[PDB]
DNA sequence: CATTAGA
DNA sequence: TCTAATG
């Protein structure tokens, strides 16, 4: 956690250079189980060889791990951490819509510039597009205000298109957090579950009456369970206007909405914990359902829920609220 | 780990 | 169809 932390940090900066950067995915497969099982070890490594007796640790790795533990350094890290190449990678890839792929594309067309982008705005598609459009504000922290107000003009909407429909806010805005990435939300309705063979405009009304009033702005893309795209509060009178935030709306069936929610809801760690959890249970727990465990090794047969509730006393927990589910 | 775009 | 990109 902190003994191993140089070490970890080099491996993963290495790691993270050749999955984009080149395209090497071993690699770069190599240096993530490597710096994964140096952070779990228990003590000070205090040279390559020690490391070394580590399973994914290498003779190659180890080498890096030397120079690194003699100088404060790495040579490799010095030069990739300079490479103009390789950092406009790094840059054009916080464009949304823009992979490593189209990157390492871009560059070796001579764009690698932001400006570069722009005098070439036709070689993009639209998600480019509006990634590029709203690149500011797309880096921008979303304001737990903010949440608010977004908050409630989604719910509202939504019931008046359909008062049966049922809408969460998830993520991090849902446990509390005082500010945002992005607006996650959870939608179901009653007349579409596991069976009952979809209703797309279920999706499609929603992401409509969204635009009619002006919160959705645009759309990186929309198809029947998953819309994902921009939104933005009513500029007030005006002086003060707000930014443009990324937002995605998923259906789904009645019947596994608070798995879904559960899940969505997190932390990464409160779920791994809540699912370890139901394992000793004799349960079994995913972003859809919680089946009970048989004996034979494995089992299904998706128990029935009503609420968040309805999971934790399942596996006989103590119901957390959102705001504590942090780990 | 799954869904949407794209060409 | 495969492949890319977000989540
Ligand atoms: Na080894
Ligand atoms: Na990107």
Redesign the pocket.
């Known amino acids: 956690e902190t003994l191993n932390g140089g070490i970890t940090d080099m491996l993963t900066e290495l790691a993270n250079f050749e999955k984009n950067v080149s395209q090497a995915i071993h690699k770069y497969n190599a240096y993530r189980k490597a710096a994964s099982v140096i952070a779990k070890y228990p003590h000070k490594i205090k040279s390559g060889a020690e490391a070394k007796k580590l399973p994914g640790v290498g003779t190659k790795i180890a080498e890096k791990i030397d120079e690194f533990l003699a100088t404060g350094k790495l040579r490799k890290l010095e030069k990739i951490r300079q490479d103009d190449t390789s950092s406009s990678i790094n840059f054009l ?1 916080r ?9 390492r594309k871009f560059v070796d067309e001579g764009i690698k510039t932001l400006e570069d982008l722009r005098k070439n705005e036709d070689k993009l ?3 480019q597009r509006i ?1 590029l459009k709203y690149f500011g504000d797309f880096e921008k922290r979303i304001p737990r205000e903010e949440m608010l107000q977004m908050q409630d003009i989604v719910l509202n909407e939504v019931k008046k298109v359909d008062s049966e429909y049922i809408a969460t806010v998830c993520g991090s805005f849902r446990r509390g957090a005082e500010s945002s990435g ?1 607006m ?1 939300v959870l939608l179901t309705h009653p007349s579409f579950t596991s069976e009952s063979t979809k209703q797309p405009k279920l999706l499609h009304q929603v992401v409509e009456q969204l635009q009619k009033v002006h919160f959705i702005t645009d759309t ?7 819309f ?1 795209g921009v939104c933005q509060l009513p500029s007030k009178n005006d002086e003060k206007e707000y930014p443009h935030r ?1 937002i ?1 709306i998923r259906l789904i069936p009645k019947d596994q909405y608070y798995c879904g929610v559960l899940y969505f809801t997190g932390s990464d760690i409160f779920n791994k914990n809540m699912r370890a959890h139901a394992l000793e249970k004799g349960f079994t727990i995913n972003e859809y359902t919680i089946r009970p465990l048989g004996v034979t090794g494995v089992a299904g047969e998706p128990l029935p829920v009503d609420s968040e509730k309805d999971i934790f006393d399942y596996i006989q927990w103590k119901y957390r609220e959102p705001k504590d589910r942090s780990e």
């Not at 464009?95 to 990157?103: C, D, L, N, R, T």
């Not at 990186?220 to 998953?226: A, C, I, Q, Y």
């Open positions: 890839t464009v949304s819509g823009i992979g490593p792929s189209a990157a598609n639209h998600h990634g992005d996650d990186l893309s929309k198809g029947e369970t998953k994902m990324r995605d």
